[PDB]
Amino acid sequence: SATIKVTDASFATDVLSSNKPVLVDFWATWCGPSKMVAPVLEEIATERATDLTVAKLDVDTNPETARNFQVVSIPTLILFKDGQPVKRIVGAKGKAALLRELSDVVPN
Ligand SMILES: *C1=CC(=O)C=C[C@]1(O)c1nc2ccccc2s1
């Protein structure tokens, strides 16, 4: 997987301080509908690798990070730019739709 896995511990280096925008997928190990977005994210990570990084955070095992960023529904996607959560996406989408939301902030 072109996507990366992040934790509470790794979040600051992996996501926050990244000079490249990161799309973070807040998901649950025990939620099946929350895993539906994974393949699409995988396609995106490979296809748009120069423009964007894709990260996956398991809210089940990293509760504080999920709470700090105020994730209320799963799956949730938050785009991080220069350390800030600049974009929040709820309701799982198709690829074209997801890419359209992201284009406002990401080139290509
Ligand atoms: C709720 C209950 C469940 O059994 C699986 C995970 C969940 O948190 C979610 N359910 C849905 C259903 C539709 C879309 C998204 C989610 S998350």
Whether the CB-CB separation of 25 and 41 falls below 8 Å is answered with yes
CATH of the domain at 77: 3.40.30.10
| Domain residue limits at 27 | 1-108
The structural domain count of the chain equals 1
Mutate to test the pocket of ligand 1, among 60, 74, 93 (most ligand atoms within 8 A of CB): 74
- Ligand 1 lined by 94 (C-beta under 6 Å): no
Q: How far apart are CA 68 and CA 48, in angstroms?
A: 28
Centre a 10 Å sphere on the Cβ of residue 102 and count the other Cβ atoms it contains.
Answer: 21
Residue 85 Cα to chain centre, angstroms: 10
Whether the CB-CB separation of 79 and 102 falls below 8 Å is answered with yes
Q: How far apart are CA 63 and CA 70, in angstroms?
A: 10
If you measure from the C-alpha of residue 38 to the centroid of ligand 1, how many angstroms do you get, rounded to a whole number?
Answer: 14
* Gaps in the chain following residue numbers (C to N > 2.5 A): none
Q: How far apart are CA 64 and CA 45, in angstroms?
A: 25
If you measure from the C-alpha of residue 77 to the centroid of ligand 1, how many angstroms do you get, rounded to a whole number?
Answer: 15
If you measure from the C-alpha of residue 6 to the centroid of ligand 1, how many angstroms do you get, rounded to a whole number?
Answer: 22
Using the atom order of ligand 1, give the atom closest to the CA of residue 73: 17
- Ligand 1 lined by 34 (C-beta under 6 Å): yes
Q: Solving technique for this entry?
A: X-ray
Exposure string for 39-63, b = 16+ CB within 10 A, e = fewer: ebbeebbeebeeebbbbbbbbeebe
Q: How far apart are CA 27 and CA 25, in angstroms?
A: 6
